[PDB]
Ligand binder design. Structure first.
Ligand SMILES: O=c1ccn([C@@H]2O[C@H](COP(=O)(O)NP(=O)(O)OP(=O)(O)O)[C@@H](O)[C@H]2O)c(=O)[nH]1
Ligand SMILES: O=c1ccn([C@@H]2O[C@H](COP(=O)(O)NP(=O)(O)OP(=O)(O)O)[C@@H](O)[C@H]2O)c(=O)[nH]1
Length: 326
């Protein structure tokens, strides 16, 4: 077994949150918000004199892709769900359609909100993000998400299920398990080391897309038993180094200097840079913490004391990373 592998797997056990298909609590919180939208929609449509449109829900985000992590103590997790309304996109305003959902949920938990890319509804210790789509069958065969706020506002080409397929299909079996563990490791690193300023934090979807582009399996196959052991520390080292290698100095005419920028395109429509909202200064801070994480992964390979190897990693991963006594 690889150095620190046992402690990586124990860390993984502590940070993992079970996917929808394995998690009754998340399925119930999801389904309660879905019910709340159906009932809520009757109310909104009683003023327009016809049946509210029906919707088809589907799982999205980390609990659909089995890349979910528990929040830090007193943080919130996000349940992500898509609803495809039985509407033609050209017949309705995206913000109008997101308004229906917001007003449907106005009086659910601590209220609803219209975001650039979703309607978010707040409850204790978690929020639910409802991506709102028009019917492809009614909208010229494309799946379009409702983008923009009151203060702003389009139907944008979207492919959440294609993204989810890409993440599921990149690898299989125990190879795909290491891939998923390494996404979760970086999500906990993100939560632990970007807690000062949430806006500066690399989005979960960006770490997932980065893994899609750049993650490589690390495993060794015994010359005798042919028995296979995974090396998460080495997989993470190679993955982090590859991300660092893809930062590019980018000139900023206002500040008259360069900032290092990591561009991570979604591998499906709309193929946008998921990190495009991060400022140059937030990118410089992201790069420096990634470099510090890389340095710790290399130190952890070289320590004679397992205590010192694990301590070096706990400095970047936080309180759930096991540190054996010296
Ligand atoms: O397909 C999609 C796309 C987007 N989303 C949801 O959209 C959210 C992305 O976050 P956001 O873009 O909706 N937030 P925003 O209002 O732009 O913040 P800011 O302008 O800085 O003040 C995420 O929480 C996703 O879960 C989906 O759920 N599904
Ligand atoms: O830019 C994009 C593109 C796509 N999506 C879509 O939104 C869904 C996930 O929504 P999300 O933004 O919450 N991503 P997630 O993986 O849950 O990060 P995290 O909560 O930190 O673990 C996915 O099914 C994507 O297809 C976005 O949210 N943003």
């Amino acid at each position: 077994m690889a150095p620190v592998q046992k402690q990586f797997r124990e860390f993984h056990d502590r940070i993992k949150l079970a996917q929808y298909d394995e998690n009754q609590t998340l399925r119930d919180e999801r389904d309660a918000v879905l019910t709340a939208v159906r009932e809520g929609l009757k109310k909104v449509f009683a003023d327009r004199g016809e049946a509210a449109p029906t919707f088809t829900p589907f799982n999205q985000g980390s609990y659909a892709m089995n890349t979910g992590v528990k929040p830090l103590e007193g943080g919130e997790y996000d349940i992500d769900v898509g609803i495809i309304l039985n509407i033609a996109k050209d017949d309705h305003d995206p913000v109008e359609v997101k308004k229906w959902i917001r007003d449907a949920l106005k009086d659910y938990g601590n209220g609803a909100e219209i975001r650039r890319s979703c309607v978010t509804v707040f409850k204790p210790g978690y929020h639910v993000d409802l991506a709102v789509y028009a019917d492809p069958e009614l909208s010229g065969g494309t799946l379009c998400i409702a983008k923009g706020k009151e203060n702003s506002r389009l139907w944008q080409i979207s492919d959440p299920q294609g993204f989810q397929d890409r993440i599921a299909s990149k690898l299989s079996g125990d190879d795909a398990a290491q891939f998923r563990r390494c996404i979760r490791y970086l999500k906990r690193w993100r939560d632990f080391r970007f807690s000062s300023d949430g806006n500066a934090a690399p989005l979960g979807i960006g770490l997932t897309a980065a893994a899609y582009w750049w993650f490589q399996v690390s495993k060794r196959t015994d010359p005798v038993s042919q028995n296979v052991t995974y090396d998460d520390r080495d997989a993470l080292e190679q993955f982090v180094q590859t991300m660092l290698d893809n930062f590019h100095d980018t000139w900023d005419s206002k500040d008259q200097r360069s900032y290092p920028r990591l561009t991570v395109e979604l591998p499906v429509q709309p193929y946008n840079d998921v990190f495009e909202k991060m400022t140059g200064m937030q990118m410089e801070s992201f790069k420096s913490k990634l470099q510090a994480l890389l340095n710790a992964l290399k130190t952890a390979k070289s320590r004679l004391e397992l205590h010192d190897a694990c301590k070096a990693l706990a400095d970047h991963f936080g309180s759930e990373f096991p540190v054996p006594e010296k």
